[PDB]
Amino acid sequence: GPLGSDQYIVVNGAPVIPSAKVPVLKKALTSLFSKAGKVVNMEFPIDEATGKTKGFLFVECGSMNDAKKIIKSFHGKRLDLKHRLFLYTMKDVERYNSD
Incomplete structure (x- = not known):
């Protein structure tokens, strides 16, 4: 992203x-994450064959500090009784792609 x-x-x-x-999951996660920091955009990769989400997403935040606060608030926490979320800064993944 830019x-x-x-x-x-x-x-x-x-x-x-x-x-x-x-759209329902996106608004739900955006609403939750917004409690900790500004979310600018959120995107869910889709498995084309099945039309399903893959279970991970990329989030663009309003600043580095917003990203850090979101990770701190949500990393390792249960979303519900079936799912637990794990959040990481994307920088090294971006650079592994581009270096």
């Missing part, structure tokens, strides 16, 4: 659902 590398987060462990349901 913002600073350390403003992006990868979230793992989210629901695997028909992607018809992404």
